[PDB]
Design a protein around this ligand. Structure first.
Ligand SMILES: O=C(CN1CCCC1)c1ccccc1Cl
Ligand SMILES: [Zn+2]
Length: 138
């Protein structure tokens, strides 16, 4: 679990979005596994504006932050886990690291701020949904 809170926006994994998220829907993209909902209170996160390919992510299944190199956002086939199998996800970045069911919503950050949230994992890879192209979140 986990979310990004920037201005009056909450960014979550679309598949973890709550009733409240869908009641306050601003924007969702099935192909990116992202949903943005409106918040009453002000968020304190800043979104990175950069093409950083290094940063640090939070891994809840290890209670640890890991530094990683990660690929530029791309269209990628995500193999089966305990969710919908071999699905195509856009704006996805991969790194070598640990990701396990429950690690979704972990934030990936660089010196510029928030890059993305954990979305996929397995086989020693971690996938992050990029948010940096969503300039409107600012
Ligand atoms: O964190 C998740 C997604 N869900 C969050 C709560 C149940 C799982 C995940 C991470 C890595 C690999 C596969 C998955 Cl499903
Ligand atoms: Zn950066």
């Amino acid at each position: 679990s986990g979310a990004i809170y920037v201005g009056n926006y909450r960014v979550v994994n679309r598949h973890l979005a709550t009733h409240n998220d869908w009641a306050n829907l601003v924007w969702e993209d099935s192909s990116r596994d992202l949903l943005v909902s409106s918040t009453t209170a002000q968020g304190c996160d800043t979104i990175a504006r950069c093409d950083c390919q290094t940063g640090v992510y939070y891994c809840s299944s290890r209670r640890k932050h890991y530094p990683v190199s990660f690929s530029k956002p791309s269209l990628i086939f995500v193999e089966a886990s305990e969710y919908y199998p071999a699905r195509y996800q856009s704006h996805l970045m991969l790194a070598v690291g640990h990701s396990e069911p429950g690690d979704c919503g972990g934030i990936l950050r660089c010196q510029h701020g928030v890059v993305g949230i954990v979305s996929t994992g397995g086989n020693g890879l971690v996938g992050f949904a990029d948010v940096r192209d969503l300039l409107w979140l600012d």
